[PDB]
Amino acid sequence: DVVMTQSPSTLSASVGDTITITCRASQSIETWLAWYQQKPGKAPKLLIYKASTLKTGVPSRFSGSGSGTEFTLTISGLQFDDFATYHCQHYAGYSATFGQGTRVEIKRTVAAPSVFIFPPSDEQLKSGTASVVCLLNNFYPREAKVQWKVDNALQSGNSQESVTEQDSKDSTYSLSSTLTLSKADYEKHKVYACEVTHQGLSSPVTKSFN
Amino acid sequence: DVVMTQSPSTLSASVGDTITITCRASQSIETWLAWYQQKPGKAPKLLIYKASTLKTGVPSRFSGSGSGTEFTLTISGLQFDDFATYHCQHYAGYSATFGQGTRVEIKRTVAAPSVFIFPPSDEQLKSGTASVVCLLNNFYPREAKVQWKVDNALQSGNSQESVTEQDSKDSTYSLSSTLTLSKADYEKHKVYACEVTHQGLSSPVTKSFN
Amino acid sequence: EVQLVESGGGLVKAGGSLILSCGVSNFRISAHTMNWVRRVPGGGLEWVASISTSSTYRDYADAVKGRFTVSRDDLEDFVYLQMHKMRVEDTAIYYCARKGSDRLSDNDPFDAWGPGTVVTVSPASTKGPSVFPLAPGGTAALGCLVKDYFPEPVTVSWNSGALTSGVHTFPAVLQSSGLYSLSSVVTVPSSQTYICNVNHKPSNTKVDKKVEP
Amino acid sequence: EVQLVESGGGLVKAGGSLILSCGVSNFRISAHTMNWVRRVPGGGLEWVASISTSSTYRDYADAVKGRFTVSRDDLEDFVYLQMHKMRVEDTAIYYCARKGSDRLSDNDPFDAWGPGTVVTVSPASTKGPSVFPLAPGGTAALGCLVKDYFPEPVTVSWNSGALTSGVHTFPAVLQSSGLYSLSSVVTVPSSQTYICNVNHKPSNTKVDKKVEP
Ligand SMILES: OC[C@H]1O[C@H](O[C@@H]2[C@@H](O[C@@H]3[C@@H](O[C@@H]4[C@H](O)[C@@H](O)O[C@H](CO)[C@H]4O)O[C@H](CO)[C@@H](O)[C@@H]3O)O[C@H](CO)[C@@H](O)[C@@H]2O)[C@@H](O)[C@@H](O)[C@@H]1O
Ligand SMILES: OC[C@H]1O[C@H](O[C@@H]2[C@@H](O[C@@H]3[C@@H](O[C@@H]4[C@H](O)[C@@H](O)O[C@H](CO)[C@H]4O)O[C@H](CO)[C@@H](O)[C@@H]3O)O[C@H](CO)[C@@H](O)[C@@H]2O)[C@@H](O)[C@@H](O)[C@@H]1O
User: C166 burial class (0-12, 13-18, 19+ CB within 10 angstroms)?
Assistant: middle
Do C142 and C207 reside in the same domain of the chain?
Answer: yes
d(CA D178, CA D151): 9
Amino acid (1-letter code) at residue D14? A
Find the CB nearest B184 among A127, A183, A184.
A127
Q: What is the resolution of this structure in A?
A: 2.0
* CB–CB contact D19 C10 (8 Å): no
Question: Residue A128, by phi and psi: left (phi above 0), alpha (psi -120 to 50) or beta?
Answer: left
* CB–CB contact C7 D84 (8 Å): yes
d(CA B176, CA B139): 12
Do A30 and A131 reside in the same domain of the chain?
Answer: no
Query: Residue A110 in contact with residue A56, Cβ under 8 Å?
Result: no
* CB–CB contact C10 D8 (8 Å): no
CA angle at residue D21 from D59 to D87, to 5 degrees?
Answer: 65
Q: Is B187 helix (H, G, I), strand (E, B) or coil?
A: helix
Which ranges constitute the DSSP H helices of C116-197?
A: none
Q: How many CB pairs under 8 A join A and C?
A: 74
Do D51 and D134 reside in the same domain of the chain?
Answer: no
d(CA D14, CA D124): 6
User: B195 burial class (0-12, 13-18, 19+ CB within 10 angstroms)?
Assistant: middle
d(CA D134, CA A120): 8
Look at residues C195, C212, C206, C213 and name the one whose alpha carbon lies nearest to residue C159. Answer: C195
d(CA D148, CA D128): 8
Is C45 in the A-facing interface, judged by CB distances under 8 Å?
Answer: yes
Do B125 and B73 reside in the same domain of the chain?
Answer: no
Does any ligand 1 atom lie closer than 6 A to the CB of residue C105?
Answer: yes
Do D33 and D119 reside in the same domain of the chain?
Answer: yes
Do C67 and C83 reside in the same domain of the chain?
Answer: yes
User: C93 burial class (0-12, 13-18, 19+ CB within 10 angstroms)?
Assistant: buried
* Phi, psi of D160, rounded to the nearest 5 degrees: 45, 45
Query: Residue C29 in contact with residue C52, Cβ under 8 Å?
Result: no
Look at residues C79, C113, C76, C62 and name the one whose alpha carbon lies nearest to residue C8. Answer: C79
CATH code of C201's domain: 2.60.40.10
Q: Which residue of C has its CA nearest to A101?
A: C44
Do A47 and A130 reside in the same domain of the chain?
Answer: no
d(CA B35, CA B82): 13
Q: A54-61 long-range CB contacts below 8 Å, 24 or more apart?
A: A55/C111, A56/C102
DSSP chain A: ---EEEE-SEEEE-TT-EEEEEEEESS--TT-EEEEEE-TTS--EEEEETTTEEPTTS-TTEEEEEETTEEEEEEES--GGG-SEEEEEEEETTEEEE---EEEEE----BPPEEEEEPPPHHHHHTTEEEEEEEEEEEBSS-EEEEEEETTEEP-SSEEEEEPPPPTTTS-EEEEEEEEEEHHHHHT-S-EEEEEEETTSSS-EEEEE-
CATH code of B132's domain: 2.60.40.10
DSSP B44-93: -EEEEETTTEEPTTS-TTEEEEEETTEEEEEEES--GGG-SEEEEEEEET
User: B94 burial class (0-12, 13-18, 19+ CB within 10 angstroms)?
Assistant: middle
DSSP C54-105: GG--EEE-GGGTTTEEEEEETTTTEEEEEE-S--GGG-EEEEEEEE--SS--
Do C20 and C101 reside in the same domain of the chain?
Answer: yes
Query: Residue D8 in contact with residue D117, Cβ under 8 Å?
Result: yes
d(CA A99, CA A94): 17
- Domain end call among B55, B86, B107: B107
Q: Provide the domain count of chain B.
A: 2
B141: domain range? 108-210
β-pairing, A10-13 vs A102-106, is: parallel
* Phi, psi of D72, rounded to the nearest 5 degrees: -135, 155
Do A55 and A129 reside in the same domain of the chain?
Answer: no
Q: Provide the domain count of chain C.
A: 2
User: A92 burial class (0-12, 13-18, 19+ CB within 10 angstroms)?
Assistant: middle
Look at residues D63, D38, D41, D37 and name the one whose alpha carbon lies nearest to residue D50. Answer: D37
Is D52 in the B-facing interface, judged by CB distances under 8 Å?
Answer: yes
Query: Residue D11 in contact with residue D124, Cβ under 8 Å?
Result: no
- Domain end call among A107, A140, A173: A107
Do B20 and B101 reside in the same domain of the chain?
Answer: yes
d(CA C60, CA A96): 10
Query: Could you give the count of Cα atoms lying within 13 Å of B71 in the half-sphere of its Cβ?
Result: 33
Contacts of A8 (CB under 8 A, 6+ apart): A21, A102
**Pocket test residue of C47, C106, C107, C108 for ligand 1, highest count of atoms within 8 A of CB:** C106
Contacts of D87 (CB under 8 A, 6+ apart): D14, D121
DSSP chain D: --EEEEE--EEEETT--EEEEEEEESS-STTS-EEEEEE-TTS-EEEEEEE-GGG--EEE-GGGTTTEEEEEETTTTEEEEEE-S--GGG-EEEEEEEE--SS--SS--EEEE---EEEEEES-S-BPPEEEEE----EEEEEEEEEEEBSS-EEEEEGGGTB-TTEEEPPPEE-TTS-EEEEEEEEEE----EEEEEEEGGGTEEEEEEE--
Is B182 in the A-facing interface, judged by CB distances under 8 Å?
Answer: yes
Do B115 and B198 reside in the same domain of the chain?
Answer: yes
Contacts of A81 (CB under 8 A, 6+ apart): none
Do D119 and D151 reside in the same domain of the chain?
Answer: no
Method: X-ray
CA distance, residue C71 to nearest chain D CA (Å):
7
Do A40 and A67 reside in the same domain of the chain?
Answer: yes
- Domain end call among C59, C88, C123: C123
Do D85 and D166 reside in the same domain of the chain?
Answer: no
Q: Which residues pair with B91 in a beta bridge?
A: B96
Q: Which chain D residues touch B92 with a CB distance below 8 Å?
A: 107
Do D79 and D113 reside in the same domain of the chain?
Answer: yes
Query: Residue B23 in contact with residue B88, Cβ under 8 Å?
Result: yes
Do A93 and A128 reside in the same domain of the chain?
Answer: no
Is D1 in the B-facing interface, judged by CB distances under 8 Å?
Answer: no
Question: What's the length of chain C?
Answer: 213
Do D62 and D99 reside in the same domain of the chain?
Answer: yes
* Phi, psi of D33, rounded to the nearest 5 degrees: -65, 135
Do C95 and C137 reside in the same domain of the chain?
Answer: no
**Closest ligand 1 atom number to CA of residue C54:** 29
D190: domain range? 124-213
* CB–CB contact C177 D174 (8 Å): no
Look at residues D43, D89, D110 and name the one whose alpha carbon lies nearest to residue B101. Answer: D43
Q: Which residue of C has its CA nearest to D22?
A: C82
d(CA D121, CA D68): 15
Find the CB nearest B49 among D57, D97, D109.
D109
DSSP D134-174: E----EEEEEEEEEEEBSS-EEEEEGGGTB-TTEEEPPPEE
Chain A residue set in contact with C, beta carbons under 8 Å: 32, 34, 36, 38, 42-46, 49, 55-56, 85, 87, 89, 91-101, 103, 157
* CB–CB contact C170 B116 (8 Å): no
Q: Which residues pair with C46 in a beta bridge?
A: C38
Chain B residue set in contact with D, beta carbons under 8 Å: 32, 34, 36, 38, 42-46, 49, 55-56, 85, 87, 89, 91-101, 103, 157
Residue of the nearest CA to atom 43 in ligand 1?
A: C100
Do C3 and C86 reside in the same domain of the chain?
Answer: yes
> Rounded to a whole number, what is the largest CA-CA distance in chain D?
90
Do B97 and B114 reside in the same domain of the chain?
Answer: no
β-pairing, D205-211 vs D180-189, is: unpaired
- Domain end call among D95, D123, D151: D123
> Rounded to a whole number, what is the largest CA-CA distance in chain C?
90
d(CA D49, CA D70): 7
The dihedral formed by the CA atoms of D61, D62, D66 and D70, expressed in degrees to the nearest 10: 10
> Rounded to a whole number, what is the largest CA-CA distance in chain A?
64
CA angle at residue B20 from B19 to B22, to 5 degrees?
Answer: 160
Residue of the nearest CA to atom 13 in ligand 1?
A: C106
D89 C-beta neighbours (distance < 10 Å), count? 13
- Domain end call among D79, D100, D123: D123
User: D5 burial class (0-12, 13-18, 19+ CB within 10 angstroms)?
Assistant: middle
Do A103 and A140 reside in the same domain of the chain?
Answer: no
C31-47 b/e (C-beta count within 10 Å ≥ 16 → b): ebbbbbbbbeeebbbbb
Question: Residue C131, by phi and psi: left (phi above 0), alpha (psi -120 to 50) or beta?
Answer: beta
Do A87 and A124 reside in the same domain of the chain?
Answer: no
D28 C-beta neighbours (distance < 10 Å), count? 10
d(CA A83, CA D77): 46
Do D29 and D93 reside in the same domain of the chain?
Answer: yes
Amino acid (1-letter code) at residue B11? L
Look at residues A198, A197, A176 and name the one whose alpha carbon lies nearest to residue A131. Answer: A176
- Domain end call among B107, B139, B162: B107
Do A204 and A165 reside in the same domain of the chain?
Answer: yes
The dihedral formed by the CA atoms of A78, A83, A84 and A86, expressed in degrees to the nearest 10: 20
d(CA C96, CA C4): 7
